[PDB]
Coordinates of C-alpha atoms in Angstrom, one line a residue:
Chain A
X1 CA 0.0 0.0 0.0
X2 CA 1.4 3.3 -1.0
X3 CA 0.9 6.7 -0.5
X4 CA 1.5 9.8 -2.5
X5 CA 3.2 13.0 -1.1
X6 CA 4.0 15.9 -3.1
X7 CA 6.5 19.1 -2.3
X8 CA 6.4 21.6 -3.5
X9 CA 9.8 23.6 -3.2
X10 CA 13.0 24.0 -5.3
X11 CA 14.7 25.9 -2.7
X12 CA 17.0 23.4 -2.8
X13 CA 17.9 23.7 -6.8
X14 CA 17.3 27.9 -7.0
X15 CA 16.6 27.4 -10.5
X16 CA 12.4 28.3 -11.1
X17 CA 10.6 25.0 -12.3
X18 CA 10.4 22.2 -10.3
X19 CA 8.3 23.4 -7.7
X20 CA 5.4 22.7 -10.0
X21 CA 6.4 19.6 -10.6
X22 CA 4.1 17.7 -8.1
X23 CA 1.0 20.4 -9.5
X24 CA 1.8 19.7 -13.1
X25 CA 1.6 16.3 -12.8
X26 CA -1.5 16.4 -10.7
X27 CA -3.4 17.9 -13.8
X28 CA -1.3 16.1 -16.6
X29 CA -2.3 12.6 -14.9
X30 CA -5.1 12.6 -12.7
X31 CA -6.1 9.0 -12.2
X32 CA -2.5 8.8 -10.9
X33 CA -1.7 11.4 -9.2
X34 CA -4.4 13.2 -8.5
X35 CA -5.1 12.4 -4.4
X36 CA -1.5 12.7 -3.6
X37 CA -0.6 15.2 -0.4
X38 CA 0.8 18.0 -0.7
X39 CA 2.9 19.5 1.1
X40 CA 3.1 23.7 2.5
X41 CA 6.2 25.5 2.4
X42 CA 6.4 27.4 4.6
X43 CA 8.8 29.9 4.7
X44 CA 11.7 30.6 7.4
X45 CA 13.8 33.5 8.2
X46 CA 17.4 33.0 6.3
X47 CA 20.9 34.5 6.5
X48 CA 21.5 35.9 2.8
X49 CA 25.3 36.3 3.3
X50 CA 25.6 32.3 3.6
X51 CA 26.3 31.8 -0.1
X52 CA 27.1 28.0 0.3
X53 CA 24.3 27.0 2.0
X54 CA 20.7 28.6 0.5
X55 CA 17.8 28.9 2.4
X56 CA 19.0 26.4 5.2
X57 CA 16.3 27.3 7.5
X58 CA 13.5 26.9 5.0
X59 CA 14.6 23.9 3.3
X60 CA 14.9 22.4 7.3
X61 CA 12.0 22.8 8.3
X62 CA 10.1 21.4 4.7
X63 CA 12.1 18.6 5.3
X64 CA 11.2 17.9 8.7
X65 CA 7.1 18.3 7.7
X66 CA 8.5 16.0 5.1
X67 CA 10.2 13.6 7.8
X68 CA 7.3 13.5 9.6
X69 CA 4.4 12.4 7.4
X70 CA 6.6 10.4 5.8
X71 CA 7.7 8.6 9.7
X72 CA 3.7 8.8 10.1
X73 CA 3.1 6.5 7.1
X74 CA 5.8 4.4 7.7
X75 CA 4.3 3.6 10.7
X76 CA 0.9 3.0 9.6
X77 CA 2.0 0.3 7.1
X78 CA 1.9 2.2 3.6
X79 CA 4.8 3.1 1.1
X80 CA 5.7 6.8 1.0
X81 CA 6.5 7.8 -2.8
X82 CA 7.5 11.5 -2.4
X83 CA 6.9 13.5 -5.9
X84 CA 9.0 16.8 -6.1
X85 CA 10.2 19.3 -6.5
X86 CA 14.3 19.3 -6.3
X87 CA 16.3 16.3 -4.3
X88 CA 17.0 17.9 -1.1
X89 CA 13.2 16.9 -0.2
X90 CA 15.2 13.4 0.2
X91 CA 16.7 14.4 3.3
X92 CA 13.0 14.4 5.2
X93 CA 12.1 11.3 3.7
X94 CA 15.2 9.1 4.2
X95 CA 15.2 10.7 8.0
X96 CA 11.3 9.9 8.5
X97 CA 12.0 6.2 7.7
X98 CA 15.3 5.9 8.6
X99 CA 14.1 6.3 12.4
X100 CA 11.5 3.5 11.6
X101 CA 13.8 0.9 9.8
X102 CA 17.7 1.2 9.3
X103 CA 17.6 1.3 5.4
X104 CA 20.0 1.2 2.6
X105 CA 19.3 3.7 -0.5
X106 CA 20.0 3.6 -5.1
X107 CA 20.7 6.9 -5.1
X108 CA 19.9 7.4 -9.1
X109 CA 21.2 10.2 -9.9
X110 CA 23.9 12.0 -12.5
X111 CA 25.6 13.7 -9.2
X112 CA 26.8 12.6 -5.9
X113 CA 24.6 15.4 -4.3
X114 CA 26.9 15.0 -1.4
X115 CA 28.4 18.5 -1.3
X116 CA 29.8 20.2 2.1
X117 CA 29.4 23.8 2.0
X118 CA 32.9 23.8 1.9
X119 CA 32.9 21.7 -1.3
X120 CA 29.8 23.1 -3.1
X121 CA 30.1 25.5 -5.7
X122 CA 26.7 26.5 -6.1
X123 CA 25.3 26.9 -2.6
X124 CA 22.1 24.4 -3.2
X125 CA 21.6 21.8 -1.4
X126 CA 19.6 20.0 -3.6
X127 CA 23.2 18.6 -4.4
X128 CA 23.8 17.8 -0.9
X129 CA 21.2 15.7 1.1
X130 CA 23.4 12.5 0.6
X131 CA 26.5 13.9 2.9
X132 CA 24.0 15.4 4.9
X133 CA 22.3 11.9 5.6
X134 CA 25.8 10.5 6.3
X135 CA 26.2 13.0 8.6
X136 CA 28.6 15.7 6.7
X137 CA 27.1 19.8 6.3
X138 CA 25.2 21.7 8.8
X139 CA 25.0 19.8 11.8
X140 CA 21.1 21.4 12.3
X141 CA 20.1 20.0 8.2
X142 CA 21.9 16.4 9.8
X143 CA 20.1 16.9 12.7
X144 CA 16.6 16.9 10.9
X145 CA 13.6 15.1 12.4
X146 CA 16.1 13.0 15.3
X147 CA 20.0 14.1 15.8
X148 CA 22.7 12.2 14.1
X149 CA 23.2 10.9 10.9
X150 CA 20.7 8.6 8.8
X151 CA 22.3 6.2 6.8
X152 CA 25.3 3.9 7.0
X153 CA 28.0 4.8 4.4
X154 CA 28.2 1.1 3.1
X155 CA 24.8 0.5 2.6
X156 CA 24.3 3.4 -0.3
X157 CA 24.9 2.7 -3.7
X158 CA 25.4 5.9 -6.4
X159 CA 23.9 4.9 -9.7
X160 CA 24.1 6.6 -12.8
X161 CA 26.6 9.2 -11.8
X162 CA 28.4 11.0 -15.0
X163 CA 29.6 14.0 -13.3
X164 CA 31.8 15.0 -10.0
X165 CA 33.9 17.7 -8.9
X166 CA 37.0 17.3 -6.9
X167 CA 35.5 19.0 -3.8
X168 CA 32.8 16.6 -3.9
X169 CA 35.0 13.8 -4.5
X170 CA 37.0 14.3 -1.3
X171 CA 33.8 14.5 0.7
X172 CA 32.9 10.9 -1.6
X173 CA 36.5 9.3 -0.6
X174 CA 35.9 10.1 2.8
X175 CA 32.7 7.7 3.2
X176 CA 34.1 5.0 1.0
X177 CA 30.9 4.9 -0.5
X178 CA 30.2 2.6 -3.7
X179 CA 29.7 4.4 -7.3
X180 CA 28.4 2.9 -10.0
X181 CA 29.0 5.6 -13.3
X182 CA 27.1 5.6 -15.7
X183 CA 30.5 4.2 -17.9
X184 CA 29.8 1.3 -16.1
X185 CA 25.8 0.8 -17.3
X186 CA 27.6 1.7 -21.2
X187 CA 30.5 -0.8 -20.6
X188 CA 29.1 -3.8 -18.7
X189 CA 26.0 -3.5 -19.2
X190 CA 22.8 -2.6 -17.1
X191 CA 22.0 -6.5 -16.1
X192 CA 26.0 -6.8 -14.7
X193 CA 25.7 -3.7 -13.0
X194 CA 22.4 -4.7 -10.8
X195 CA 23.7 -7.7 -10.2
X196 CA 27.3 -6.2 -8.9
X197 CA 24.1 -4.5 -7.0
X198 CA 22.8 -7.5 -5.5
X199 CA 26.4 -8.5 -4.6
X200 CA 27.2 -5.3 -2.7
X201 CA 24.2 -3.6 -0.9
X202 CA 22.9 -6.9 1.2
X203 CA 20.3 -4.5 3.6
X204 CA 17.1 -6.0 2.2
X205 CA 14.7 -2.5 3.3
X206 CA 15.7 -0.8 0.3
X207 CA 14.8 3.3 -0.3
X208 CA 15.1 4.8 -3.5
X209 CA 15.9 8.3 -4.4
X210 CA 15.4 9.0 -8.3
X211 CA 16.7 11.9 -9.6
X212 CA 15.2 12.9 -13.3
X213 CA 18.8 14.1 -14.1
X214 CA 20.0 10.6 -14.6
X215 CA 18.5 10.3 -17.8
X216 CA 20.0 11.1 -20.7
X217 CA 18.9 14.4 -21.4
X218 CA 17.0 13.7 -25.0
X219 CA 14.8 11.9 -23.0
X220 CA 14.6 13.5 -20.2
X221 CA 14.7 17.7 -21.1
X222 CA 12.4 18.4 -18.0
X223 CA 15.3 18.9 -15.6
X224 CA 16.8 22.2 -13.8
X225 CA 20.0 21.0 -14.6
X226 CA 20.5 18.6 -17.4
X227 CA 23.9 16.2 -17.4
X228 CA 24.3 15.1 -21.1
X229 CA 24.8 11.3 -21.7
X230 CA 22.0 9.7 -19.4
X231 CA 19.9 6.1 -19.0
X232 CA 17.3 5.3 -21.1
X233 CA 13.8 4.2 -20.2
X234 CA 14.7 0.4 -20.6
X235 CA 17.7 0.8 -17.9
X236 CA 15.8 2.3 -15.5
X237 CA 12.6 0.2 -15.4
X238 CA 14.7 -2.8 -15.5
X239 CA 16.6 -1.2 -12.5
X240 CA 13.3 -0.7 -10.8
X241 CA 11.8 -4.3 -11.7
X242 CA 15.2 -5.9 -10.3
X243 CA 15.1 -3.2 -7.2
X244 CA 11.6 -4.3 -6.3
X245 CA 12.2 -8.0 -6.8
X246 CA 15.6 -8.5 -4.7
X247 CA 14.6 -5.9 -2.3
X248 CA 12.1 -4.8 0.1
X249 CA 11.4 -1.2 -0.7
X250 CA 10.3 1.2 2.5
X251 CA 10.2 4.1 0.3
X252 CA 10.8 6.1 -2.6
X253 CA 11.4 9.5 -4.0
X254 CA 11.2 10.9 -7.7
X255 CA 12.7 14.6 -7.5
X256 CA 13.8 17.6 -9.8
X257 CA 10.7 17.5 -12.5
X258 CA 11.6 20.3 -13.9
X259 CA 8.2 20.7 -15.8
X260 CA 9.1 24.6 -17.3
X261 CA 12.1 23.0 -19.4
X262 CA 10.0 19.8 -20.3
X263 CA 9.0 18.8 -24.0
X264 CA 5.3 18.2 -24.6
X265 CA 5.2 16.2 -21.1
X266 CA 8.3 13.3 -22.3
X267 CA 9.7 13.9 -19.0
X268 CA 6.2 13.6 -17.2
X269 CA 5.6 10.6 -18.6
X270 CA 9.0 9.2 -17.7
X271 CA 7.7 10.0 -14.1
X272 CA 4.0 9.1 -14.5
X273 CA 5.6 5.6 -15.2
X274 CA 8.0 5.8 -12.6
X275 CA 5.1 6.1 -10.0
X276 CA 2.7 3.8 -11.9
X277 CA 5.4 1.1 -12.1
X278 CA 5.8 1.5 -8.5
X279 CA 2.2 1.9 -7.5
X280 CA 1.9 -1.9 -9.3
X281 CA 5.1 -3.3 -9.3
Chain B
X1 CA -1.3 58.2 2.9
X2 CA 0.3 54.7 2.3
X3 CA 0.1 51.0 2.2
X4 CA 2.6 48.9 1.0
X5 CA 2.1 45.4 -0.8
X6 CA 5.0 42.7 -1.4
X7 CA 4.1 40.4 -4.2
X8 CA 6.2 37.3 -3.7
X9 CA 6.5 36.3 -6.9
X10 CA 9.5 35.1 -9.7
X11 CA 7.3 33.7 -12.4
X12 CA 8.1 36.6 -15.2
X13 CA 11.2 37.1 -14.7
X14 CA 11.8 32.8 -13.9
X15 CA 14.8 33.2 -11.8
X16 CA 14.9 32.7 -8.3
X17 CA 15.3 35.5 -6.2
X18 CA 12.6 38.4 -6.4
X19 CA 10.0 36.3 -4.7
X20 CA 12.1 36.6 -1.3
X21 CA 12.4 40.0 -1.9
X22 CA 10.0 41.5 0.1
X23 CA 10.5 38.8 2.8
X24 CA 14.5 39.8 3.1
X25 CA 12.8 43.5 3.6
X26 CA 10.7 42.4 6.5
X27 CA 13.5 40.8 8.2
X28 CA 16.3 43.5 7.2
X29 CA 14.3 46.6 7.8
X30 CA 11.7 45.5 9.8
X31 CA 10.4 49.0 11.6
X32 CA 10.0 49.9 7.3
X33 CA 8.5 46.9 6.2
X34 CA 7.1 44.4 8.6
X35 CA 3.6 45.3 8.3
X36 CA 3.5 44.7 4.8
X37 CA 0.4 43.0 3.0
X38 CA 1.9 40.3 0.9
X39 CA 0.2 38.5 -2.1
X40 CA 1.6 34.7 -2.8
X41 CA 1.4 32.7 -5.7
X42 CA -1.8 30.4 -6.4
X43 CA 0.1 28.1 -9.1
X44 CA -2.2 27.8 -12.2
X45 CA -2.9 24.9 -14.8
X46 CA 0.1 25.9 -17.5
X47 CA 0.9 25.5 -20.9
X48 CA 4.5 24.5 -21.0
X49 CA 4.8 24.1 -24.4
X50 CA 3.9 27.6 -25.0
X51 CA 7.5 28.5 -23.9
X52 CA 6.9 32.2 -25.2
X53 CA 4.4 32.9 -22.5
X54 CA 5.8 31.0 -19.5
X55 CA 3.3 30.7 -16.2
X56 CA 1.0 33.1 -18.3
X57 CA -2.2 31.9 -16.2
X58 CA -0.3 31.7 -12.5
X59 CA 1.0 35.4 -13.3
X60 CA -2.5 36.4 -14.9
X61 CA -3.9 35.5 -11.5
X62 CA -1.4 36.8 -9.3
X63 CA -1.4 40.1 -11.4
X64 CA -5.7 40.1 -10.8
X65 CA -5.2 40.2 -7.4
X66 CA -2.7 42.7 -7.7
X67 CA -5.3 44.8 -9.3
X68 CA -8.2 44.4 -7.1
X69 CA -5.4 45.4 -4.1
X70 CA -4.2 48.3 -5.7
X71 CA -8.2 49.2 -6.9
X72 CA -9.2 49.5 -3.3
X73 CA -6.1 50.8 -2.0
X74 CA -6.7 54.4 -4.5
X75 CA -10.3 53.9 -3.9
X76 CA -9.6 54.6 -0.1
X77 CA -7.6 57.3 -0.9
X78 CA -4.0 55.3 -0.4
X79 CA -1.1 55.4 -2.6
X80 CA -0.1 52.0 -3.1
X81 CA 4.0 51.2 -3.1
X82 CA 4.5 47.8 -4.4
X83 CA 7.4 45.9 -3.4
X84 CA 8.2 42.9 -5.5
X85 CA 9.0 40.8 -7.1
X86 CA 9.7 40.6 -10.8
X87 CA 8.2 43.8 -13.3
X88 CA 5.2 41.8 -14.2
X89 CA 3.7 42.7 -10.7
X90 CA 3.5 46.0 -12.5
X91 CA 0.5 44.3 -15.3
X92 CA -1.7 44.1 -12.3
X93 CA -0.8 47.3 -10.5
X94 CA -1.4 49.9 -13.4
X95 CA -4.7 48.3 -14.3
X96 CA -5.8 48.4 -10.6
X97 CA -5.1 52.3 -10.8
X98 CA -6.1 52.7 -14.5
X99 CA -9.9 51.7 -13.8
X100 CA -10.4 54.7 -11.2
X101 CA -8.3 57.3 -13.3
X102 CA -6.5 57.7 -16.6
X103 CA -2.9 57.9 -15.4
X104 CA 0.8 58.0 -16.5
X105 CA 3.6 55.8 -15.9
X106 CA 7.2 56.6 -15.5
X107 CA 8.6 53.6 -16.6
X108 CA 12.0 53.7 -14.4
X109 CA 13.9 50.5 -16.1
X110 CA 17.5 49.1 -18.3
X111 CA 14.8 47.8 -20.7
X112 CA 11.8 48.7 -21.9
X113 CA 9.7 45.7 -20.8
X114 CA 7.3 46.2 -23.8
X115 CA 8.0 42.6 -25.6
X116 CA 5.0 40.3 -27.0
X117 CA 5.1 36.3 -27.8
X118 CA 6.9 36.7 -31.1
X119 CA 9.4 39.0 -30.3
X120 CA 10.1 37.9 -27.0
X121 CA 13.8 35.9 -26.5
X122 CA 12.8 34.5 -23.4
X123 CA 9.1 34.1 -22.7
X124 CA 9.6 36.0 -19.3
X125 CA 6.2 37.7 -18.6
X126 CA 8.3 40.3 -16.9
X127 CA 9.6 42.0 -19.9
X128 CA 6.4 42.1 -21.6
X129 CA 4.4 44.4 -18.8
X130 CA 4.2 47.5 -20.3
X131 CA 2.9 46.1 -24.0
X132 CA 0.7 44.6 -22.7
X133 CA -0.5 47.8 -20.6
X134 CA -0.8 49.5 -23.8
X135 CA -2.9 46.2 -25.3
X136 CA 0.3 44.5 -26.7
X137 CA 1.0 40.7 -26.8
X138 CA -1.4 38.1 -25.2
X139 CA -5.5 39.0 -25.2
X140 CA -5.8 37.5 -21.8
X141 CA -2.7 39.3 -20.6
X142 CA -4.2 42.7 -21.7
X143 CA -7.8 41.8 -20.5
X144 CA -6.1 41.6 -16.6
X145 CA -8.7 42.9 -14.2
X146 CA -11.3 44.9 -17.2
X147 CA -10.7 44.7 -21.0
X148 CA -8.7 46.4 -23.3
X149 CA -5.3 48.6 -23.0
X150 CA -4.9 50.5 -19.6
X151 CA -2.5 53.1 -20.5
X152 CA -2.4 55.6 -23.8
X153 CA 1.1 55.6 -25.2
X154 CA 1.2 59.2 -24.9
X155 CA 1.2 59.1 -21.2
X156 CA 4.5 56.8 -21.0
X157 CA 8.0 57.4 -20.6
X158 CA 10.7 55.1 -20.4
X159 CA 13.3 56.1 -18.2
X160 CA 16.7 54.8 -18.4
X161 CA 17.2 52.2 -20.9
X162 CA 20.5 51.0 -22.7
X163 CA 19.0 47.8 -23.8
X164 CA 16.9 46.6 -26.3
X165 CA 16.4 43.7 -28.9
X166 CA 15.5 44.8 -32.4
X167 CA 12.2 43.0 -32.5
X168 CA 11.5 44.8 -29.0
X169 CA 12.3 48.0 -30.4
X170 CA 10.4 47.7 -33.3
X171 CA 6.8 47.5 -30.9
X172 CA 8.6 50.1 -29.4
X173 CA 9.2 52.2 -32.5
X174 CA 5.1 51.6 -33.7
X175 CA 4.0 52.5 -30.3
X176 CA 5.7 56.1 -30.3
X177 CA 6.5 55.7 -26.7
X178 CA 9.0 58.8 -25.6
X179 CA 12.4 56.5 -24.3
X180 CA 15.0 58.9 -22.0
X181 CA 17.9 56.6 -22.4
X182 CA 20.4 56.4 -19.6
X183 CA 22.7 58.3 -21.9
X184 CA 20.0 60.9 -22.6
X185 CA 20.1 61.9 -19.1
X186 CA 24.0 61.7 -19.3
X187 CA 24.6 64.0 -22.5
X188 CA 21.7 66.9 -21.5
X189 CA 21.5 65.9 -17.7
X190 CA 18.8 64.9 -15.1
X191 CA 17.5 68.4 -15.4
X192 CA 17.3 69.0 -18.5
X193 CA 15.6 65.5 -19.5
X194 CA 13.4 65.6 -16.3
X195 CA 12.5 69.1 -17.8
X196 CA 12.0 67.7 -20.9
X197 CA 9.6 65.0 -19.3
X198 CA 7.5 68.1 -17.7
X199 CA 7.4 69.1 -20.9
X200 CA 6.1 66.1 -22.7
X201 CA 4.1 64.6 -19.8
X202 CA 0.8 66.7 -18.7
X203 CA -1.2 64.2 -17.1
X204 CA -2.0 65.2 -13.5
X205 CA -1.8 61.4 -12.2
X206 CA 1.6 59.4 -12.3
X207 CA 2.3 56.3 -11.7
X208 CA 6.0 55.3 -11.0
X209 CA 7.6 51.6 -11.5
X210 CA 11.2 50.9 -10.9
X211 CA 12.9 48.0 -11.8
X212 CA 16.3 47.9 -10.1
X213 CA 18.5 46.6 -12.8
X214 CA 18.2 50.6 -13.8
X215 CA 20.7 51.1 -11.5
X216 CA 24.2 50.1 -12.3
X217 CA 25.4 46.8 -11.3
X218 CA 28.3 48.5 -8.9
X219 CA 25.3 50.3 -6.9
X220 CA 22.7 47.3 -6.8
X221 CA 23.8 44.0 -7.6
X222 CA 20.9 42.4 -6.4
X223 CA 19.0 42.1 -9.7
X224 CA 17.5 38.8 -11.3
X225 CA 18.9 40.4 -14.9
X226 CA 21.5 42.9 -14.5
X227 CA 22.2 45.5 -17.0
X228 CA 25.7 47.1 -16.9
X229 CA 26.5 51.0 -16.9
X230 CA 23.0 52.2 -14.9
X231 CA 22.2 54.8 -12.7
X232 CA 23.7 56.4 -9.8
X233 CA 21.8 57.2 -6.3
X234 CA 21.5 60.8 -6.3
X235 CA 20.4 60.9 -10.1
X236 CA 17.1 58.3 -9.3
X237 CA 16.0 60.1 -6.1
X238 CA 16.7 63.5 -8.4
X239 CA 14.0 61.9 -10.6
X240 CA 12.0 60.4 -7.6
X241 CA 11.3 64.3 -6.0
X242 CA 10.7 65.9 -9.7
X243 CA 7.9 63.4 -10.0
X244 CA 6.6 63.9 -6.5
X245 CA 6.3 67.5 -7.0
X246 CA 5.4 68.2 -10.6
X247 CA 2.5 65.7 -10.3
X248 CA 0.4 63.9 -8.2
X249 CA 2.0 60.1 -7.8
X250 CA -1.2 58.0 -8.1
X251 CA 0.8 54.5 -6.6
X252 CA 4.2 53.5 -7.4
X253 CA 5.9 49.7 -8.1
X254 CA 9.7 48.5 -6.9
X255 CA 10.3 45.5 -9.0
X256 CA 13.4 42.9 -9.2
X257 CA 15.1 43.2 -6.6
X258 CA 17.2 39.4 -5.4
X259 CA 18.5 39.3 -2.4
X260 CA 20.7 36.0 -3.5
X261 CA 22.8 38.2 -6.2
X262 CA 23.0 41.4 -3.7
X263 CA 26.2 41.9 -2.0
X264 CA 26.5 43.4 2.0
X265 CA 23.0 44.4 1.5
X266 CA 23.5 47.4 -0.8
X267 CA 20.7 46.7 -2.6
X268 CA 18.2 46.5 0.1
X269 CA 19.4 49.7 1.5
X270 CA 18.7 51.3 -1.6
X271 CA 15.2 49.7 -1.4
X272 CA 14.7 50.9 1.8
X273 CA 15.5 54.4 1.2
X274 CA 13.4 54.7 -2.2
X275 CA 10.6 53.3 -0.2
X276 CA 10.8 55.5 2.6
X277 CA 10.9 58.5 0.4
X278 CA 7.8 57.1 -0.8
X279 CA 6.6 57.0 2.0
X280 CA 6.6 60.7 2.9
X281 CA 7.9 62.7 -0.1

């Protein structure tokens, strides 16, 4: 049993558009989407000076509402599927379940998103919930929902990632945490890779955090920030199918619909199947 | 008499920023501008494949209530100052004004924000608010709060451009519209252009609207789209007491300001003082 929850933010991308992701699609696909819960924004006194970390208190305290419904239906039995608006909505979720059941996490994605504000170049922390969920940033963003980090460094798996700065890749060597590039799905193959999957992430309550930037950009334009050479469709339903089967998935998140930069809904109805895929897996 | 609105908006100009703006003026001069009525964004069903238009019916709604606002602000004798917010806050300000009294705007900008669907670069709704004041671009647009144009040509100046595309400037050119460049005011001077204005001008209602890339980027960085070699303090509030005293200032509109791109809070203080001249001239 699963249960829909929209946000509703891109504070943590700062680029306008995927805010009305989870609105867009609630209009584009009704008979999916259309009794998911939203959630309110509600906006926090910030610091403007801090540069390298935008809108810290707003982004918190979203992603503790977010934490908490998403603890809430955790607890009552149901799958959250959280529907943004940028990644850093991942940071509620994966700390609303993580309190629940100790969880490993496919992180699909182009980027690490594990950026210290000493490593980011951007300031947005939709490119750093990951360290944050390890436990590296802002002690208050680690702190979300109950102190201390979320996740263990060996049970996350990186998948799809094409692009990384050095900064970043310090903060990555750090945690020892397992990558699989995108190389590797063009290489080996997509079936090798999932099963190098099943070989190294052994935690059977599996989360998923899907970013739309994994795909390759032709088929997914709808994206803040598009990294060129992505999946296809085929990889990452099989990916889903193969994370469903030798896993038991707590949750799930589908972030950084960009619908403003979208082409005649392609990247909607990547997600539309996402969610239908996983709403009948 | 006075009331000022903040409009917390970003969807004309699509670049995040301006929408905080009026929050980072509560919190940063908050004995100037913590009573302020604010207007949010209702998000609106979208076309986003008409990417010449973009959020045309979330900004047609935020810009109708806007106008009914700023209607029943002049109606109770008050002279509405508009903080903001991108320049398409502007759309539903004038119109507000317009349906009480046939007024004049002194159009305080780097661009002449009179672009339409097929001569727009962008699709930004910002730089198409004064076109479609004069009945210029989208019908829906233009029919914002009561049908048809809300301003007469005649009764517009632009103040302070040094930018324009061709296809702009050729609405531009059709319209008539009187343009002071920047380097009008620089080769006669403030006085003798602002005499000039008295000149052309003879409306006894005025309505101001800033947008504060008109200043230069060294004065005000904090601008969504900054335009390079603007004006200086002294020659805006120059322009800012001509108006208040050689005619009667029906509501005014400070647009575009981003606290993300500002620097020590220059901007804001230049904010702040524009408003509180505003405030008692």
């Amino acid at each position: 049993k699963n249960v829909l929850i929209g946000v509703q933010t891109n504070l943590g991308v700062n680029k306008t558009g995927t805010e009305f992701g989870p609105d867009d699609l609630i209009q584009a696909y009704p008979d999916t989407f259309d009794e998911m819960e939203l959630i309110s924004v509600e906006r926090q006194k910030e610091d403007f000076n801090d540069k390298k970390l935008k809108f810290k208190n707003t982004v918190l305290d979203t992603c503790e509402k977010i934490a908490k419904r998403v603890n809430e239906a955790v607890i009552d039995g149901y799958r959250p599927i959280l529907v943004g608006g940028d990644h850093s909505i991942s940071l509620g979720s994966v700390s609303g379940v993580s309190l629940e059941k100790e969880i490993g996490v496919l992180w699909i994605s182009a980027h690490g998103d594990m950026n210290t504000p000493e490593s980011t170049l951007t300031g947005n922390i939709h490119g750093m919930p990951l360290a944050l969920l390890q436990g590296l940033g802002d002690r208050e963003l680690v702190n979300c929902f109950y102190e201390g980090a979320k996740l263990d460094s060996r049970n996350i798996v990186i998948f799809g990632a094409r692009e990384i700065e050095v900064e970043e890749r310090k903060i990555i060597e750090k945690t020892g945490v397992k990558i699989v590039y995108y190389d590797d799905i063009l290489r080996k193959g997509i079936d090798n890779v999932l099963d190098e999957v099943k070989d190294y992430l052994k935690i059977d309550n599996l989360h998923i955090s899907i970013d739309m930037n994994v795909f390759d950009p032709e088929i997914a334009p709808g994206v803040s920030v598009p990294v060129r050479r992505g999946m296809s469709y085929d990889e990452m339903f099989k990916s889903l199918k193969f994370a469903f089967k030798n896993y038991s998935v707590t949750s799930a998140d589908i972030t950084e619909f960009n619908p403003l930069n979208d082409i005649n809904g392609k990247t909607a109805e990547l997600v539309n199947g996402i969610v239908q895929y996983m709403m009948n897996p």
